[PDB]
Design a binder for this molecule. Structure first.
Ligand SMILES: Nc1nc(Cl)c2ncn(Cc3cnc(-c4ccccc4)o3)c2n1
Length: 209
């Protein structure tokens, strides 16, 4: 079964701002997702120091960037700590409430959308370029789940029926029709060089066949 949920009110409001406000500097979404992956890799690496079995689901710690011009998707894959069902439905939204309110306040005071990561809600910058986001994720202590939202106030969670991940997270960006530049190998290279050239895990930009 597929379960459908309403976003926290502040988060639905934030998504509507992101999806609708005119802002040309959309490329910052990739830096934010890569930063999130780095944070998740940091966390499983840290936990493995006192419990090495936490890496039985996979010893490699890396980030992969996978464009698909055919599917019009850009996928960010990490082997980080992954997200639980409770993370997807409640916990990550709850911790984002105060940062979301503060961010939207700062936007009214003159801040820029590119500061979204400094408020801890950089995940939602995905909707600068994506009409729908699918998140496939697997935490050691939980099953593999698929989260999905096209904004509009709601999201779904279901147990994943795809191939097992071991552990980590795949963020699948279903790009807007006019945002296909983020499938170009040279555009992705430019963005990664510019924003996140100091990330401590191997980042591999897959080439299309
Ligand atoms: N890649 C990666 N991995 C891990 Cl474990 C993360 N934990 C937090 N974030 C950033 C984030 C902040 N809100 C979300 C979010 C994601 C899906 C559905 C609803 C909300 O994600 C992570 N990103």
């Amino acid at each position: 079964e597929v379960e459908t949920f309403a976003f926290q009110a502040e988060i639905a409001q934030l998504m509507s701002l992101i999806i609708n406000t005119f802002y040309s500097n959309k490329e910052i979404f990739l830096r934010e997702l890569i930063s999130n992956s780095s944070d998740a890799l940091d966390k499983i690496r840290y936990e493995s120091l006192t419990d090495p079995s936490k890496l039985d689901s996979g010893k490699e710690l890396h980030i992969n960037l996978i464009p698909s011009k055919q599917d019009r998707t850009l996928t960010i894959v990490d082997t980080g700590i992954g997200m639980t069902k409770a993370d997807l439905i409640n916990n990550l939204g709850t911790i984002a409430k105060s940062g979301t309110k503060a961010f939207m306040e700062a936007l009214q005071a003159g801040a820029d959308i590119s500061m979204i990561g400094q408020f801890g809600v950089g995940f939602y910058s995905a909707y600068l370029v994506a009409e729908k986001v699918t998140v496939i994720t697997k935490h050691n202590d939980d099953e593999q789940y698929a989260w999905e939202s096209s904004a509009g106030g709601s999201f779904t969670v279901r147990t994943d029926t795809g191939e097992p991940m071991g552990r980590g997270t795949k963020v699948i960006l279903h790009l807007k029709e006019d945002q296909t530049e983020y499938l170009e190998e040279r555009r992705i290279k430019e963005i990664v060089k510019k924003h996140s050239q100091f990330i401590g895990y191997p980042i591999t930009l897959f080439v299309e066949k």
